[PDB]
């Protein structure tokens, strides 16, 4: 089989910096009419550029290298952009729930460090979150749902630069 790569993505791999993280690789099972038990390796690859554009890719195949390569290229096909404060923290408090998992995410002032669970440490270093305290609640037994949940939870927040043109009201003085 052959995985796809476009033309205009080939200004980006020559463009931004990039890092790659496999989320988890999982072996599923199916007993099938005719020959027996067919398995697929499902692989989940995250890819960011450490400046606030994040990507996820889920891939399914028969063997582990081909599965991780498919999810590797699927993530690099699928990128979404996430606003940060100066590349280290998120704008608001963030709460979200994918499948039924209660993530709770807070901003922290820069130089707090990442106080953060296992895979989400590489995830926040991937997209570029240097200073965030998180906790995940509910059944945390799946890596895939915390990855997808984290992508949507990043996409939830609100940006202040879409106001100053049209609110008549200037937005500055960040002194605590």
């Amino acid at each position: 089989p052959l995985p796809p790569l476009p033309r205009e993505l080939r200004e980006a791999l020559y463009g931004h910096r990039w890092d790659r993280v496999i989320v988890d690789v999982r072996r599923t099972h199916t007993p099938v009419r005719g020959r027996g038990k067919r398995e697929e390796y499902t692989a989940m690859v995250a890819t960011g550029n450490m400046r606030g554009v994040f990507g996820l890719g889920i891939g399914v195949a028969e063997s582990a290298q081909l599965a991780t390569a498919r999810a590797h290229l699927d993530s690099l096909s699928r990128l979404a952009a996430v606003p940060l404060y100066r590349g280290h923290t998120l704008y608001t408090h963030v709460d979200h729930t994918f499948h039924r998992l209660s993530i709770r995410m807070m901003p922290r002032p820069a130089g707090w460090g990442l106080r953060c669970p296992d895979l989400l440490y590489e995830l926040c270093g991937l997209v570029g979150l240097r200073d965030v305290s998180i906790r995940v609640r509910g059944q945390r037994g799946s890596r895939f749902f915390v990855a997808q949940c984290f992508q949507e939870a990043l996409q939830k927040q609100t940006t202040p630069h879409d106001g100053v043109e049209a609110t008549g009201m200037y937005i500055r003085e960040v002194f605590r």
């Binding site: 704008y91 608001t92 927040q157 106001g163 100053v164 049209a166 609110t167 008549g168 009201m169």
Partner: protein, 284 residues
Amino acid sequence: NNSCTFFGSIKRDVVNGVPFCLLRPSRLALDMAKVVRNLGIVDGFEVVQRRSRLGAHDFVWLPEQQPQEPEHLYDTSLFRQRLIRLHLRTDLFSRLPGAPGSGAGGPQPASAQLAPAVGLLPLSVKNISKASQPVLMYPRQLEEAAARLPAGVFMCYHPQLGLITDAMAQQYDVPALVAAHVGLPLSQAAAIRGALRVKAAEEAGKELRHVTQLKDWNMMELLRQRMVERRAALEAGGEVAARLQELREAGLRLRDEASDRVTSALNVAQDLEDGALAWQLVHS
């Protein structure tokens, strides 16, 4: 009970996609609906009545002949089984040319805005006071729990100021009986606290009950006036012509050097093709 009923119905129809919010009205529901229309959390409200069970002649709400905005319970409990229909602010603009029922007078913002398809911006409003447990948040604690929850403006009570936000609760440094917490764009909550700092600059040193309370002051119409006079002063700017003309001179420099580089490259191609022509002429 009416505050939690109001904010509960907001939470109801935001998570249910209904863009109209209809309450059993009171003094609180009317006044704080004027508050959230003034800050622009919604775009407007009207009293409505379930007109199918009006009588042969009850009193009936004429919107045109009545003045546009009621301001007391007794005028809104004269009739039989009213409701107050909030016109929820769907996108990141109020549609003053729409004027969704009641709203700001005069349909003129200066520049037209984006046309976003966002659903209903009061997002996951949380009643943090609670009819069993009232909570005072002494204002530094109110700040430190404001970062506990996402972006938006607390609705608070104080006896000398009435139905207030967290912003004038902090800048007048009084404890405030906080009611709930609306979700909001960060730019909006920025605009509320900026304009309330400007209000405290106008209302400086006045006695606290003599403060123009938050129902009495429509924020969006005032900011619309600032926008209108600002675009008026800049259009009738002058130095704006010199600013534009030096922009024109920069652009003219860019396209003059671009055209001269074009003539140079075309002369290069003409000369080298003539050179190949003359060289094939010589070697033949």
